[PDB]
Amino acid sequence: EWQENKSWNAHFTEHKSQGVVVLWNENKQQGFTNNLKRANQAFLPASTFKIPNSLIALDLGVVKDEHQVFKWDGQTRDIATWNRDHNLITAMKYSVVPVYQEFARQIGEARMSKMLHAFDYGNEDISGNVDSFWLDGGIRISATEQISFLRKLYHNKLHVSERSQRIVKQAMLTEANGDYIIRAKTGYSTRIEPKIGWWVGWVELDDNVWFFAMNMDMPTSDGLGLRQAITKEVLKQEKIIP
């Protein structure tokens, strides 16, 4: 079941923004959104693709564990935190594209395609460069499809090892306190219009889990913080978090 709650539209417009938030109550098996159509609108995943990319790299032995160090290749890029050594945890944290492009080249077209078919991930189309298709290739995924994929990961039901799924869920850790845990990944798609931002993941409570997927128009990088801020306004209104 899916319910549209148009009162949530204010969380976008009052931030001078436009987008969709999708929530899924795991215990009750019910979904909610401010915009049913945009909840099903398919976009480039951009850096949210680091979730499936991590899983594939781990399960094929491209990445040995969350401590293996991926050396900076010495090229100075415009994002300062990219110009250093990383492991899987910090590469996720800082959304280090060049590390994951190396992952993708080592995975290769055939294995990448097979894995995304097995994951039932979006349109399963990797057309483009093997090392940039999630940024300017043919792959597309909607917010509700992100939730489908995340629910499989949470329950260790994807067609990779349990170990691989546990490690990626560790690398997705974003916030934790006495009230909730958030495991999630941001995305920022700029190479093809429309420019958008993503935030997808879930909120762990003592007695339930709330999955979420949001995207929003992102004409400038100045609004990137709104990905989390808008989502948290929805979570607070629904009393999922204080």
Ligand SMILES: NC(=O)c1ccc(-c2cccc(C(=O)O)c2)cc1
């Ligand atoms: N102007 C830009 O092209 C640009 C590109 C990427 C980032 C970035 C880098 C690291 C983490 C995140 C993030 O959202 O978590 C975003 C910022 C700015």
